[PDB]
């Protein structure tokens, strides 16, 4: 199963202190029986909850083969690195939470191909660059909290960005 291999590759690139990924056996056929993973009735990974679990390291580019992922939560950790450019391949993603981390780099262009996104929070990070315009094409987006970062450039004011209030983009002196 490709989903199990992708999750195991994510495990290899992550260091854990209290061993919250001890049950991620790669020999199993389906990863639904694992812990912190929730599947649908067709044995497809549709939820991965890893919030407030002591972790460190960096993400991987293999987090793009989970086609039916709907909720990815990796907040309140010590992860560091750059957001993979393949995260835009998750067409069914509904909620992408990655706040309270130590990320750096820039918001990828590929996060504009998601037409089902509803939540997008990246609080307390160290991202830089400029806000991509592709965010305006996401009409279904409802919650956006790009604050406490090092972003710059111009704030979009067209599309779904019209309804958003200044609290969405706060504590960004270079914005």
């Amino acid at each position: 199963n490709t989903e199990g291999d992708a999750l195991y590759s994510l495990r290899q690139s992550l260091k854990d202190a209290n061993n919250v990924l001890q049950s991620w056996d790669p020999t199993l056929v389906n990863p639904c029986t694992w812990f912190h993973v929730t599947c649908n009735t067709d044995n497809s990974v549709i939820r991965v909850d890893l919030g407030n679990a002591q972790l460190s390291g960096a993400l991987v580019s293999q987090l793009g083969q989970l086609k039916n992922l709907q909720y990815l939560e990796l907040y309140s950790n010590n992860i560091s690195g750059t957001i993979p450019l393949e995260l835009g391949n998750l067409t069914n993603l509904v909620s992408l939470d990655l706040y309270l981390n130590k990320f750096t780099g820039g918001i990828p262009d590929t996060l504009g191909k998601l037409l089902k996104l509803r939540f997008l929070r990246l609080n307390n990070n160290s991202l830089s660059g400029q806000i991509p315009q592709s965010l305006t094409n996401i009409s279904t987006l409802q919650v956006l909290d790009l604050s406490n970062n090092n972003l710059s450039g111009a704030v979009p004011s067209t599309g779904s960005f019209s309804l958003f209030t200044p609290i969405s983009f706060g504590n960004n002196p270079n914005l």
């Binding site: 929730t38 909850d49 919030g51 509904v94 939540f119 409802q142 309804l163």
Partner: protein
């Protein structure tokens, strides 16, 4: 002069500390790892997993009379000399160069040493293709070329000249082509390990005629057709293992000759398209330990007799996706060591046997999506150890005990007709999913000290009444909650908004009343529906944006100071 030659090998390897006794101490025969014949010349050099490193020495060719040479498990690297067969020796029989870091291609001069009995160039970093000249060693007895970085190549036909082999370990060597037809002519084989490759063709009907096999393993290939073993040719009574494991195209019924092996211990025939009824002959073999048929198109029923013998070794059964019908075998755990039973996505009906519910050795029961009925015996939750129960989508009935096992960690009994009351202490549980059941009565008072490790709870569709416990907020690592379509009344707990990883709260179609808790807003919520209730007051500021549109609809006494079904204060 042999002392200088022997120490030159050490000098080449930068004087490893292991060979610290090789310093001119009289005779060299008392030196470790060195054996001499009656004449004093070295006859054996066994340096297995010692720790040496460096390139392959070229002075070893001066050690005339060498008979045994073992350099396995070390850190030797580089490239085998092209003239290895012209100077290394003439009386060697046990060349063992495996597990090293050797680069390059296999030298073709190895055919000039026709006295070998064991040649193992496996687990190295070789490249190229298996040379045909390697078939000139007609005296070989063990050839292992596995896990090498070869290229697309077919086994040479000259390998048909090796009629005395005892081990053919060609595990991973990028092979293609058809199945070798000369394998059935090696009437001395003990291990045959043609493993993951790109071979194609039909399994011959003559390979089952060699009465010396002990392990048969063909894991990943492109074999087609069906196992067509014929009557009057089955003679491999000593066969221990059969692992036709994953070919995706094997068809035909399972052979009836697999039920007459008095030493079989592992039968793996999954990931194929076998059809027909599973033979009833395999229910009396007093040696079987593992039966795995994960995914196939088998019809019929499970064999009636399975583990009835009190002195047996049956501990694993796994048929995870098939069209099997009938009833679960009665006497499964009679020996007292049964540990697993997986029959998901099938059409078996009946009831849980009384024997299976009293086996105090169980580890993993995974019956699900079948058409079972009846009542589950009350002893299934007390006597046997159980860490994974996945009884889903059945018509079973019963009543869980007050206290569950201390090591239960997964319970999926959704879409059933279970009754009784909710267990009050199931220490070690991490997934309690049970919906559309017939549970009744008030929920247990604490539910926060007997299950401190819960991660996901679902009790929708039940008939529970009473009130929400105030200790539910004490469950630290809980992510999903669901108590919808019930008759719960009372007040929403005020501390429910103080837990850490709450992210899914469904409390729709209930009889709750009161004010929405303010601290509920400060959560990483991704789903929420507090609708079809008798709540009163005003929606707290923050949970009123367009995201939470269909959440409070159906509440006559609710107003906002963007929402559907909510009036204005």
């Amino acid at each position: 002069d042999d002392r200088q030659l022997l120490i030159r090998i050490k000098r080449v390897w930068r004087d490893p500390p292991v060979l610290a006794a090789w310093n001119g101490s009289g005779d060299h025969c008392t030196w470790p790892y060195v054996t001499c014949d009656a004449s004093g010349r070295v006859t054996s050099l066994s340096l297995a997993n010692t720790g040496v490193a460096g390139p392959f020495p070229d002075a070893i060719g001066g050690l005339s009379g060498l008979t045994s040479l073992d350099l396995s498990g070390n850190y030797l690297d580089g490239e085998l000399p092209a003239d290895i067969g012209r100077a290394l020796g003439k009386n060697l029989t046990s060349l063992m160069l495996n597990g090293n870091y050797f680069n390059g291609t296999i030298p073709t001069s190895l055919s000039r040493l026709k006295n070998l009995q064991s040649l193992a160039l496996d687990n190295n970093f070789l490249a190229g293709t298996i040379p045909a000249e390697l078939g000139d060693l007609t005296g070989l007895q063990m050839l292992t070329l596995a896990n090498n970085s070869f290229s697309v190549g077919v086994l040479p036909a000259s390998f048909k000249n090796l009629t005395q082999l005892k081990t053919f370990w060609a595990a991973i060597c990028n092979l293609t082509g058809d199945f070798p037809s000369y394998v059935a002519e090696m009437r001395e084989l003990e291990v045959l390990d043609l493993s993951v490759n790109a071979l194609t063709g039909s399994i011959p009907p003559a390979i089952w005629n060699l009465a010396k096999l002990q392990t048969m393993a063909l894991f990943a290939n492109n074999f087609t057709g069906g196992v067509v073993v014929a009557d009057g040719a089955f003679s491999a009574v000593n066969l221990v293992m059969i692992d036709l494991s994953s070919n995706h195209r094997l068809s035909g019924p399972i052979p009836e000759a697999f039920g007459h092996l008095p030493n079989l211990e592992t039968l793996n025939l999954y990931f194929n398209n076998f059809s027909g009824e599973i033979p009833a002959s395999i229910g009396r073999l007093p040696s079987l330990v593992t039966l795995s048929l994960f995914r196939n198109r088998l019809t019929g029923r499970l064999p009636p007799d399975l583990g009835k013998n009190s002195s047996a070794g049956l501990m694993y059964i796994d048929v995870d996706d098939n069209e099997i019908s009938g009833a679960i075998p009665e006497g499964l755990c009679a020996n007292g060591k049964f540990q697993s039973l997986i029959a998901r996505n099938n059409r078996l009906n009946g009831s849980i046997p009384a024997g299976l519910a009293s086996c105090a050795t169980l580890n993993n029961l995974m019956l699900g999506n079948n058409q079972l009925s009846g009542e589950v015996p009350e002893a299934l939750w007390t006597v046997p150890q159980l860490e994974y129960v996945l009884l889903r989508n059945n018509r079973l009935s019963g009543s869980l005990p007050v206290k569950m096992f201390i090591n239960l960690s997964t319970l999926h009994i959704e879409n059933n007709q279970f009754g009784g009351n909710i267990p009050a202490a199931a220490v070690g549980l991490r997934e309690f999913i049970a919906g559309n059941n017939n549970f009744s009565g008030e929920m247990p008072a604490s539910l926060g000290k007997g299950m401190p490790l819960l991660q996901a709870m679902n009790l929708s569709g039940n008939q529970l009444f009473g009130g929400i416990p105030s200790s539910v907020a004490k469950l630290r690592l809980l992510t999903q909650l669901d108590l919808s379509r019930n008759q719960l009344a009372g007040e929403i707990p005020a501390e429910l908004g103080a837990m850490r990883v709450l992210s899914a709260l469904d409390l729709s179609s209930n009889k709750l009343s009161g004010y929405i808790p303010p601290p509920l807003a400060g959560l990483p919520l991704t789903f929420l529906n507090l609708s079809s209730n008798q709540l009163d007051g005003q929606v707290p500021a923050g949970l009123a944006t367009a995201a939470y549109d269909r959440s409070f609809l159906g509440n006559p006494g609710l107003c906002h100071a963007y929402l559907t079904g909510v009036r204005s204060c």
